[PDB]
Design a protein around this ligand. Structure first.
Ligand code: CLA
Ligand code: CLA
Ligand code: CLA
Ligand code: CLA
Ligand code: CLA
Ligand code: CLA
Ligand code: CLA
Ligand code: CLA
Ligand SMILES: CCCCCCCCCCCCCCCC(=O)OC[C@H](COP(=O)(O)OC[C@@H](O)CO)OC(=O)CCCCCCCCCCCCCCC
Ligand SMILES: CC1=CCCC(C)(C)[C@H]1/C=C/C(C)=C/C=C/C(C)=C/C=C/C=C(C)/C=C/C=C(C)/C=C/C1=C(C)CCCC1(C)C
Ligand code: SF4
Ligand code: SF4
Ligand code: SF4
Lengths: 220, 42, 80, 74, 742, 68, 138
């Protein structure tokens, strides 16, 4: 199991390095965009022409590699925590027998150790783990909210905001109040960044709540 | 046999499906007659 | 506003001018190509940045280039 | 122990991503090719296709066979 | 006459030449590939007939023959289910002991240890347990032997051959003209009176003459081998009159309107059969007969060659008022000229009907021994819910396609379509506000309850032991429907369903149906459903109404139904097409149907399904935890997701291990989808440039130049793998859980 | 079960009256076809089909309510 | 010169028309002449009937006016259209076609704006022009 998880770690490190190195070395230009250095480090795209140029900047390679970095630290910390939890319990053979297939990771590490965390509050009462029980769900929420900025893109939201602008301008007792800045949808790069921020915060808070509450429930 | 039907049979999806099914049938029959080969016997 | 440049690889096919939804580009007289004309961008304050002109350009890497810059009411395409 | 290990490893991932990101920013903003003629940096740029293709190969190699062993065991 | 048969003979020669020319249908594609994008384009526009030609006649002929091909595939599928029931099933043993034999009609070959999937299903049989409900259908139809199933399979195969021959004949040999297809009145008359009416009448004939006596003998305890064959019920009127004495009177009471004489086999009993837990088959026979009469009557409404009948154009143009301008004028031309408008309406209607089927089939179980077959109930509810959601979103998609392509403003001046377009901003703004209101005052109740239970304030929650949100209207409707027998339906013996209230119908110590009470949690989850449906409507309707133009893009119709963007300008115009609205609405449909089926699964396992023991108490599967746990997100996470996934994750080494494998694989495909959804094309094209350099170094670069997937194809591939992964995860989880505990 | 009656002369009278009422009504309200000029077989079939529909409904209703 | 008294196409109105920024920041006008009364699609959504003779119409954006111009050019063979910009002060600025000749046709007197005298691959590196007001074009 240790063999397999280090080779998975090797996969994740090499792939994150692939994204980051490919972003750094194609930052000045590629065959699809030979004048990329004229456009800077961060820009949304170069338009739908030449086949389409979504996420072509080096900033976008940073953005793509952030998910792979979260994935590799997730794998590393999962391995560390499961091995140490099985060793501290005096049940290292559980890790030795269950880590060689993915269902062992899902059942004997994620599902099994979630029980004191998800029982921090229940319809019968609450205890000190409840805050982590909250934060866990909190993480599962904000991570999902990140998905909204990474799947849905700008023009839909701009047309909705145009309808809302019409609604506010045509509503009595509210058109007495006027914005100073025109409401617009978030830009393409900004939305990529905001989805990344919600995604990353959900990742960190979910795993932190899980690791602290699970170790506290089993041992403390 | 009609040459146009043979040319259709030579298309990439048909030949892909036939070749991968043929390969799968080799693996299946090899594992049917020689199962549980975790290792090369030496 | 956005900045639109036309480089001397232009062949004067007038496709970028026909593709422009905002009347930013126009054809002026030139001697550098067989068509005798080159694109120009005198009205980039009306440029929304859609890059339809770059999509229309047939020269290997583009002769017309749009560099997105400072956003205004016109360049953001705001009807409000 | 769990919190400390997890904390500093996530900090490590953030720092390494930042190192490569600001290296990309250096290539966009600060890299002068004429000042770096036949340099080690210039030769990285001159065999970037080999570097990226061999990284792609080793990633696909590792992923194909590691995921295959895990799914095989499952 | 005006409605006549006009046909062209041999319009298209039957030849294999175009089989060897991929992309022949499209002038753009017929030149051949130069990049790999062509390949994707070849599979992407192929059945998009209106984009290959402008002739409506050729499009209609292609549509008619493709529909014949689909009917052939459906008949082959049905014949397969009948054959696999005949040869590879435990159906006879299930007929002898329905309450103790798990239905199974799939047997695997032993190759790599997959023979473990041939589980011990009872009846001396090993196989994969099936949940499609075919065993109950065949028992309801009176099929008592596997020989009859073999004959049914042969009939399905023969009908498949007939359909595929009809497709070839009606495209390649005798293709109807456009004037034949443009008879909406004649098509509606024939399909209402002949397809639905005569179909209901003939199935009522089968139910009365075959299904009722065989099922009456089966419920009385007669072995299936000693039951007389159906033709013996046809010819021996004395044998038929032994079970239903009114058959001694013959057809005289029908023709003399002395219909009450038939009251012993045409009933209005309601409720459920206590022996089987299904609907009374006499009630279904009167139901299908009454539906046959109503459909045949409805099929004489529309004008045809003879002078009698309604003209639908006149009906539409007469209905117009002061709020609506020209009213319904111009809609007949749209619906007789645009195939996409008809597909939009019919897909929306078929989806809504599938959803109605799921609700009405769980609540009033129509087949014998299907109510206590909990895996079958959960499977068919979830399946028809998913089919309904997909078809409704498809109706929105093909509405958007009509709006972009076939809409003509000259023929649509100041009618309802024009006025809807002209107040689209008011519509979408009010819908946006009501969606935000529904989201706040439905999901924030769950968030508020999570915080209150986490903060140790149980008296501040929204619950039945706390500040209450009583679903008083639905409870009142339940009281009305419970009080209905003898009061507002005086000739019904029992309620339409026991879910509204009444006794606990139990079959074989398992609850067939019991009252489904509604509390605070039911209030919150029904308003969650209302929120999700209104948001899906918001996305799809905004995409349809802004498909042609908007304040952002004034010439959106020139770009088409399906385009990635109009560039980074105007701030960014990404995902601006109606297709991208369908792309987002499919995600929101997934969210809605997922919450609906989770509500169904938890509520049935917690409050309805269970075992009946001494003193009449019902021990439910999860012991009534829904009332106090489904008011928080933590309760859904722990008591539904964490608790009920124990069966799929501990399935390894058992017959249900395929569900664990599919569970893991569907999580994998779902995660794999996020690579396509979160990323963009330019990165992959530059990475492909480096890989092309690697292949070029070894002189193995392909002639067909590899390209990254298009932006629209990236979205479509991400959405397809996302839907497959999520639906497969719920599929494996539901099936493993309900097979183990039910 | 609602009471229905065996066939009698009253049932025939109601059916005949409903058929004749529907024949006259079809003469008056049918838009596309001395008062019985233009009267064709499809119009007679439609009127008599409505006459059996209306007569069946009336006979069943009058047997329900006790008029028989 | 924009004649404000030119009659408008018969339109029933819509919610897609111009907002307060038209009367506060700027508005656009398009005029054209039709040989007959005929139905066209509004760029803001809806069908309107243009009259025989002159037509004046008001929009919020220049792109809406040019979209309407392209529609009437490619569907009704109307090419005499004129697009103006109107300010709240009453100033009318003629916009399109700017010199009377359409921009896709070469006209005398036009001077090239934004033309660069080399190919796009000859631009300067950002490190060359950093902390310096030189343009990247050279
Ligand atoms: C009473 C006459 C009648 C009947 C039964 C049907 C039935 C049907 N039509 Mg239809 N049609 C009719 C008249 C009729 N039509 C007329 C007059 C027109 C011209 C205006 C059309 C024009 C038309 C079009 C344009 C299309 C249809 C389609 C369909 C099919 C709908 C899909 C479905 O539910 O199939 C499942 C239902 C079944 C009953 C499956 C069995 C199919 C066979 C053909 C039934 C034949 C029954 C036969 C008459 C009696 C034998 C039964 C028994 C006595 C042995 C269905 C088979 C659609 C289709 O799918 O075409 C292929 C379609 O696109 N029809
Ligand atoms: C001599 C004339 C005569 C008489 C006395 C009757 C008498 C009767 N008929 Mg009858 N009928 C007649 C002529 C007559 N009919 C004719 C000429 C026809 C045409 C063929 C019918 C067709 C007919 C049908 C089809 C039925 C009756 C029924 C009945 C019984 C009704 C019981 C009741 O309270 O209704 C019930 C009262 C209700 C309020 C129930 C509501 C019904 C549905 C569920 C509601 C549908 C409405 C829907 C919501 C749409 C409204 C929304 C709107 C805003 C758009 C009653 C004894 C019924 C019967 O026999 O039941 C045993 C029955 O089903 N009749
Ligand atoms: C790259 C990953 C990888 C590798 C190296 C292997 C390697 C192997 N697998 Mg595995 N497998 C994989 C992925 C992989 N698999 C995946 C992804 C799945 C799921 C689809 C499976 C499912 C699977 C099953 C179900 C079985 C194997 C078997 C085998 C053995 C082949 C025996 C054989 O054909 O003799 C060749 C014989 C000749 C005569 C030639 C071999 C040890 C078989 C075996 O023997 O297990 C030990 C077997 O039963 N594998
Ligand atoms: C000591 C470490 C360090 C330092 C000094 C910087 C400093 C800088 N970074 Mg960097 N970066 C770091 C770590 C660091 N970063 C790490 C760890 C990551 C990975 C998450 C990044 C990822 C990153 C990206 C992707 C980008 C920067 C950018 C920037 C520049 C502007 C930051 C800004 O506007 O944010 C202001 C933020 C706030 C005021 C919010 C508080 C600035 C030179 C940006 C830039 O302009 O470079 C071209 C840019 O695009 N950096
Ligand atoms: C579980 C999810 C998942 C998976 C499997 C992958 C897989 C991959 N990503 Mg990826 N990615 C993901 C999520 C995922 N990603 C997400 C969420 C993001 C953030 C947006 C990214 C961002 C990303 C970037 C930015 C890059 C990758 C790269 C890669 C590839 C190299 C790594 C590897 O293991 O190669 C091995 C490949 C695999 C394990 C893929 C699975 C192959 C299957 C199992 C083979 C069997 C196919 C099967 C028979 C088909 C049957 C279908 C038929 C029945 C219909 C590989 C295709 C890099 C790349 O292209 O490297 C070359 C790269 O540059 N990805
Ligand atoms: C398409 C549907 C369909 C078909 C093909 C049949 C076919 C048949 N029915 Mg049936 N039936 C049907 C629908 C259908 N039924 C429905 C919907 C009802 C409810 C009103 C009935 C009620 C019914 C009765 C009550 C009887 C039949 C009888 C018969 C048989 C005719 C013998 C005869 O003429 O005696 C004519 C007898 C006279 C006295 C005159 C025949 C097997 C008769 C039979 O033989 O019983 C098996 C019989 O007694 N049927
Ligand atoms: C009655 C059903 C029906 C019919 C006849 C059509 C017909 C059409 N649609 Mg429509 N549609 C429908 C339902 C229907 N649709 C539904 C329910 C949806 C919602 C999902 C849509 C969404 C939709 C969109 C969004 C679009 C269409 C388009 C089209 C047109 C071309 C389709 C084409 O060439 O695809 C060719 C066929 C394929 C590419 C095969 C698709 C294979 C799918 C994606 C994967 C199947 C996975 C499988 C089920 C499970 C695999 C699992 C396994 C691997 C483990 C055509 C007019 C397109 C168009 O251009 O119209 C003008 C278009 O853009 N439709
Ligand atoms: C869990 C993830 C998540 C969440 C919360 C949302 C939230 C929302 N989406 Mg969204 N979306 C998501 C994932 C998510 N999305 C994904 C993955 C996709 C990909 C396809 C989309 C695609 C999508 C589309 C296409 C549309 C939406 C729409 C909406 C809005 C619906 C209106 C509503 O419910 O208002 C109520 C708001 C909420 C329920 C958000 C949570 C707020 C709760 C109640 C707590 C509030 C507490 C308070 C603010 C605390 C203040 C503290 C202070 C310090 C700030 C809302 C902003 C629609 C929209 O905007 O129009 C209405 C719309 O058209 N989304
Ligand atoms: C719905 C409420 C309702 O009763 O509307 C009914 C009303 C019907 O208007 P008219 O009487 O003009 O309708 C005549 C035709 O539209 C019907 O044949 O519709 C409107 O007033 C427009 C929609 C208002 C929608 C507001 C929401
Ligand atoms: C892209 C970007 C553009 C330009 C700027 C840029 C920032 C420069 C660049 C990014 C570059 C990027 C950021 C590069 C990031 C790079 C990585 C993280 C460097 C890691 C180096 C490991 C070294 C060789 C120590 C190895 C241990 C070995 C020697 C030990 C042996 C032995 C020890 C003594 C002891 C015992 C064990 C054994 C094994 C026996
Ligand atoms: S979809 Fe968005 S990111 Fe992609 S090319 Fe179009 S505008 Fe640029
Ligand atoms: S980006 Fe668009 S508006 Fe700007 S010049 Fe090019 S085509 Fe015209
Ligand atoms: S499209 Fe390109 S080549 Fe043609 S005129 Fe414009 S800039 Fe010159």
């Amino acid at each position: 199991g240790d063999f397999l998880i280090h080779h998975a770690i090797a996969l994740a490190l090499h792939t994150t390095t692939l994204i980051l190195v490919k972003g750094a070395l194609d930052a000045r230009g590629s065959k699809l965009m030979p004048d990329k250095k004229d456009f800077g480090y961060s820009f949304p795209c170069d338009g739908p022409g030449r086949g389409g140029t979504c996420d072509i900047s080096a900033w976008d390679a940073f953005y793509l590699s952030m998910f792979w970095m979260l994935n590799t630290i997730g794998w590393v910390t999962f391995y560390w925590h499961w091995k140490h939890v099985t060793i501290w319990q005096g049940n290292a053979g559980q890790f030795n027998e269950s880590s060689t297939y993915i269902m062992g990771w899902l059942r004997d590490y994620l599902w099994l150790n979630s029980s004191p965390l998800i029982n921090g509050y229940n319809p019968f009462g609450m205890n000190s783990l409840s805050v982590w029980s909250w934060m866990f769900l909190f993480g599962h929420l904000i991570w999902a909210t990140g998905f909204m900025f990474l799947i849905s893109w700008r023009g839909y939201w701009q047309e909705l905001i145009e309808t809302l602008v019409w609604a506010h301008e045509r509503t009595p007792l509210a058109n007495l109040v006027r914005w100073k800045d025109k409401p617009v949808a978030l830009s393409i790069v900004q939305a990529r960044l905001v989805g990344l921020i919600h995604f990353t915060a959900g990742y960190i808070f979910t795993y932190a709540a899980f690791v602290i509450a699970s170790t506290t429930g089993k041992f403390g | 046999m009609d040459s146009n039907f043979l040319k259709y049979l030579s298309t990439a999806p048909v030949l892909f499906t036939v070749w991968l099914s043929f390969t799968a049938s080799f693996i299946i029959e090899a594992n049917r007659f020689f199962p549980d080969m975790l290792y090369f016997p030496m | 506003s956005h900045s639109v440049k036309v480089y001397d690889t232009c062949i004067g096919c007038t496709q970028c001018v026909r593709a422009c939804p905002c009347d930013v580009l126009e054809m002026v007289s030139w001697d550098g190509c067989k068509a005798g004309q080159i694109a120009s961008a005198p009205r980039t304050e009306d440029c929304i940045g859609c890059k339809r002109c770059e999509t229309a350009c047939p020269t290997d890497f583009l002769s017309v280039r749009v560099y997105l810059g400072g956003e205004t009411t016109r360049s953001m395409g705001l009807a409000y | 122990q769990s919190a400390l290990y997890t904390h500093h490893q996530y900090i490590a991932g953030f720092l390494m991503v930042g190192a490569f990101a600001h290296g990309a920013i250096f290539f966009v903003r600060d890299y002068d090719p004429e000042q770096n003629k036949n340099n080690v940096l210039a030769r990285i740029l001159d065999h970037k296709e080999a570097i990226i293709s061999h990284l792609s190969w080793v990633s696909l190699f590792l992923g194909f066979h590691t995921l295959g062993i895990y799914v095989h065991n499952d | 006459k005006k409605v006549s048969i006009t046909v062209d003979r041999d319009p298209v020669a039957t030849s294999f030449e175009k089989w060897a020319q991929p992309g022949h249908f499209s002038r753009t594609l017929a030149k051949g590939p130069k990049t790999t994008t062509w390949i994707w384009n070849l599979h992407a526009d192929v059945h998009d007939f209106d984009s290959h030609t402008n002739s409506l006649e050729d499009i209609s002929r292609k549509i008619f023959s493709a529909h014949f091909g689909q009917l052939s595939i459906i008949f082959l599928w049905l014949s397969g289910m009948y054959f696999h029931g005949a040869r590879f099933s435990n159906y006879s043993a299930w007929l002898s002991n329905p309450t103790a034999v798990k239905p199974s009609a799939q047997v695997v070959w032993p190759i790599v240890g997959q023979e473990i999937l041939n589980g011990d299903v009872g009846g001396g049989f090993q196989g994969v347990q099936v949940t499609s409900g075919f065993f109950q259908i065949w028992r309801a139809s009176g099929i008592t032997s596997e020989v009859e199933l073999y004959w049914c399979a042969l009939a399905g195969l023969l009908m498949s051959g007939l359909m595929i021959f009809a497709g070839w004949f009606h495209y390649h040999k005798a293709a109807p003209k456009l004037e034949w297809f443009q008879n909406a009145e004649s098509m509606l008359n024939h399909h209402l009176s002949g397809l639905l009416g005569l179909g209901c009448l003939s199935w009522a004939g089968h139910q009365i003459h075959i299904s009722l006596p065989v099922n009456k003998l089966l419920d009385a305890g007669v072995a299936p081998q000693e039951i007389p064959l159906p033709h013996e019920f046809l010819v021996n009127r004395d044998l038929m009159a032994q079970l239903y004495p009114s058959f001694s009177k013959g057809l005289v009471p029908f023709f003399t309107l002395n219909w009450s004489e038939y009251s012993d086999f045409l009933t209005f009993k309601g409720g459920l059969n206590p022996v089987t837990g299904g609907l009374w088959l006499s009630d279904t026979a009167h139901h299908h007969l009454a539906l046959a009469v109503l459909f045949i009557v409805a099929g004489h409404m529309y004008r045809t060659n003879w002078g009698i009948g309604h003209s639908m154009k006149e009906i539409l143009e007469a209905h117009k008022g002061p709020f609506t301008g020209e009213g319904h004028k111009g809609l007949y031309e749209i619906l007789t000229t645009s195939w996409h408008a008809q597909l939009a309406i019919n897909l929306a209607m078929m989806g809504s009907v599938s959803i109605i089927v799921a609700h009405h089939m769980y609540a009033m179980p129509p087949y014998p021994y299907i109510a206590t077959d909990y895996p079958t109930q959960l499977s068919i509810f979830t399946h028809h819910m998913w089919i309904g959601g997909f078809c409704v979103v498809g109706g929105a998609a093909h509405a958007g396609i009509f709006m972009v392509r076939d809409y003509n403003p000259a023929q649509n001046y100041n009618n309802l379509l024009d006025r809807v377009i002209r107040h689209r901003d008011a519509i979408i703004s009010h819908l946006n506000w009501i969606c935000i209101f529904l989201g706040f005052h439905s999901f924030g109740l769950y968030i508020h309850n999570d915080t209150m239970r986490a903060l140790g304030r149980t008296q501040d929650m929204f619950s039945d032991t706390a500040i209450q949100l009583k679903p008083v209207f639905a409870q009142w409707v339940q009281s009305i429907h419970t009080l209905a027998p003898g009061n507002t339906t005086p000739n019904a013996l029992a309620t339409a369903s026991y879910a509204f209230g009444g006794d606990v119908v139990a079959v074989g110590n398992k609850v067939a149906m019991m009252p489904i009470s509604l509390g605070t949690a039911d209030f919150m989850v029904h308003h969650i459903h209302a929120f999700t449906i209104h948001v899906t409507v918001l996305i799809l309707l905004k995409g349809v109404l802004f498909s042609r133009n908007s304040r952002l893009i004034p010439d959106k119709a020139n770009l088409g139904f399906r385009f990635p963007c109009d560039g980074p300008g105007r701030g960014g115009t990404c995902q601006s097409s109606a297709w991208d609205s369908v792309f987002l609405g499919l995600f929101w449909m997934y969210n809605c149907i997922s919450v609906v089926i989770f509500h169904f699964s938890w509520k049935m396992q917690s409050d309805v399904w269970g075992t009946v023991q001494a003193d009449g108490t019902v021990t439910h599967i999860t012991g009534g935890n829904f009332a106090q746990s489904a008011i928080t997100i933590n309760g859904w996470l722990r008591d539904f997701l964490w608790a009920q996934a124990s069966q799929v994750i501990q399935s390894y080494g058992s017959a249900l291990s395929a569900y664990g494998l599919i569970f893991l694989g569907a999580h994998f495909i779902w995660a794999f989808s996020l690579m396509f959804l979160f990323s963009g094309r330019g990165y992959w094209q530059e990475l492909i440039e480096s890989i092309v350099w690697a292949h070029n170094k070894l002189n193995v670069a392909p002639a067909i130049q590899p390209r990254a997937l298009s932006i629209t194809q990236g979205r479509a591939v991400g959405l397809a793998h996302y839907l497959l992964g999520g639906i497969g995860t719920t599929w494996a989880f539901f099936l493993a859980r309900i097979i183990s505990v039910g | 079960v609602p009471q229905t009656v065996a066939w009698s002369a009253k049932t025939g009278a109601v059916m005949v009256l409903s058929n004749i009422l529907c024949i006259v009504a079809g003469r008056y309200v049918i838009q596309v076809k001395g008062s019985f000029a233009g009267f064709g077989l499809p119009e007679l079939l439609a009127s008599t089909s409505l006459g059996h529909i209306v007569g069946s409904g009336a006979i069943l209703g009058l047997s329900y309510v006790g008029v028989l | 010169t924009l004649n404000l008294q030119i009659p408008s196409p018969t339109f029933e109105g819509s919610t897609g028309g111009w907002l307060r920024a038209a009367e506060v920041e700027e508005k656009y006008a398009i005029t054209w002449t039709s040989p007959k009364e005929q139905v066209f699609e509004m760029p803001t959504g809806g069908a309107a009937i243009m009259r025989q003779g002159e037509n004046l119409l008001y929009l919020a954006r220049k792109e809406q006016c040019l979209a309407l111009a392209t529609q009437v050019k490619n569907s009704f063979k109307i090419t005499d259209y004129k697009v103006y910009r109107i300010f709240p002060s009453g100033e009318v600025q003629y916009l399109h076609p700017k010199d009377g000749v359409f921009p896709e046709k070469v006209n005398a007197g036009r001077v090239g704006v934004g033309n660069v005298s080399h190919s796009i691959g000859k631009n300067l590196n950002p490190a060359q022009i950093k902390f310096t007001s030189k343009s990247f074009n050279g």
